[PDB]
Amino acid sequence: GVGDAELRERLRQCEETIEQLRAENQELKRKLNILTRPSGILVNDTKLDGPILQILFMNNAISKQYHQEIEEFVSNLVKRFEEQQKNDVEKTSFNLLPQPSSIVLEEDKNNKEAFSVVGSVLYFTNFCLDKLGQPLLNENPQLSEGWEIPKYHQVFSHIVSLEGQEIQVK
Amino acid sequence: GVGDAELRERLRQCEETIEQLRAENQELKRKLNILTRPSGILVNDTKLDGPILQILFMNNAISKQYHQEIEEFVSNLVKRFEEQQKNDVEKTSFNLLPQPSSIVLEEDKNNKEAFSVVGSVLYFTNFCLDKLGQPLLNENPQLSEGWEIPKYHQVFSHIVSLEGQEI
Amino acid sequence: LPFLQPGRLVKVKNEGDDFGWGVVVNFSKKSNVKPNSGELDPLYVVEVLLRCSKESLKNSATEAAKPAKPDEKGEMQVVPVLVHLLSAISSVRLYIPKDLRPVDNRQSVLKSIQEVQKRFPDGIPLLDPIDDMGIQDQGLKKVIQKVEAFEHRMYSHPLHNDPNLETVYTLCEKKAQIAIDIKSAKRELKKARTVL
């Protein structure tokens, strides 16, 4: 009796908990509309098919009158990559993903090597808001395709380590 | 007894399902933060002090070897913007907002003019997967930022209609 | 109106024929000059690039109609259409040439609409009325509920799974049209000499 009533109350509470969770798993995909991944596409390649990049044009930005130079620029990149296809050399030039957050799929083939956000930044007048970084090859920034190191003098022979951990760098 | 045990098993199964939904929600949290809203940002130059774009780089050799000219391009775009003055060319038409989907406000009052993203397009090198359209004033789509109309000849002189109201 | 950029791949059917898929070129709120029987609502004209027939272009003054037939290769031209004829809005924006007005670039546009159809064999994703536009008007929820209900029981029907459904559909359409014809003929015959 009392135990049965307690069990029924617990079951009702659990169902309500799921409702809250059911409600969130319904109101999230609403804001997630921006990401589309529309339907079944047929990507017979992974180095020339698939998207390039997703731009979120910002409001209250007087810099939106440039809506054409961006498009023509991102269109001339593919034709320049075609005219600069390669100086044919055998190299894998493979890359992995630091952050696996792929765009959602509301489509009721490939979905891993494509439709995967690799980097997202939020440009400012001078700032940036990177949180995912460029993917690396063998943890060495000296041969990657995107990174580019500035020039500097570097006369600071021998680091200051912590407590008794002097390391003879050179 | 047996009925009580079955009820307990059903309750446990329901709890396990609840846990899975909670884990899925915690996962989808990641996706609902790439929008980003660090905190309340101090801005003064309303509509001139704030983000300009938000590029989401995608897995493709073009978007991970040609990266640096994209950054120099956004840079040269932000610099070339400040060499016009003594003009009213910013909106010039009272360009009210289209119907946006505002980025979630992360808390970690004021600023009702907030980000309110106003578009998104996917490039596949032979088309464009647009959404959210593009802002423009009440009418007259030739006095707004954007909308570069091509040149056509308009050889026809009789508009199609359902019945009547012919040109 | 904010969804009418050049390349939107609209569809047009003014109850007579299918033109196909075509890219939008321009649009305007041009009102009725010299309004016949007055004017109280504004109309909009969309200048959109369809695929017309050779016979339609050779005169190009009678009705601006009769798109090309599957037995002819046809030629594409920009045609003005009414706003209330757009039976489908897509979510794809083919790139448009610069300054145009020849033949070859329109042929490339034809080629482009031809590969893009070779990428969504299921069907081009057009739009979602609930979210993409941003409608917050009371009542549309009722109609979407009703459409979801009707299609739910539709597929929930066994006949749907059964084959030869199309043949029976055509038969029923034919007999319904015969019934309509007989109704109209009896309506006319009910006035052969009736208080004329």
Residue numbers in the entry:
A (entry chain C): 43 to 150, 160 to 221
B (entry chain A): 43 to 150, 160 to 218
C (entry chain B): 651 to 846
What did the published study say regarding this structure?
The nuclear exosome targeting (NEXT) complex plays a central role in directing non-functional transcripts to exosome-mediated degradation, but the structural and molecular mechanisms remain enigmatic. Here, we elucidated the architecture of the human NEXT complex, showing that it exists as a dimer of MTR4-ZCCHC8-RBM7 heterotrimers. In terms of architecture, we found that the biological unit of NEXT consists of two copies of each MTR4 and RBM7, assembling symmetrically around a highly intertwined ZCCHC8 homodimer, with an arrangement conducive for targeting different RNA substrates.
The smaller version of NEXT (defined as NEXTS) consisted of full-length MTR4, a truncated mutant of RBM7 containing the RRM domain (residues 1–98, for simplicity referred to as RBM7; Falk et al., 2016), and a truncated mutant of ZCCHC8 in which only the minimal MTR4- and RBM7-binding regions remained (residues 41–337, referred to as ZCCHC8S; Falk et al., 2016). The cryo-EM analysis of the NEXTS complex resulted in a reconstruction with a global resolution of 4.5 Å. This density was separately fitted with the atomic models of the MTR4 DExH-box domain and arch domain, as the latter has different conformations in the available crystal structures (Lingaraju et al., 2019a; Wang et al., 2019; Puno and Lima, 2018). In our reconstruction of NEXTS, the MTR4 arch domain of both protomers is arranged in an inward conformation, similar to that observed in apo human MTR4 (Wang et al., 2019) and apo yeast Mtr4 (Weir et al., 2010).
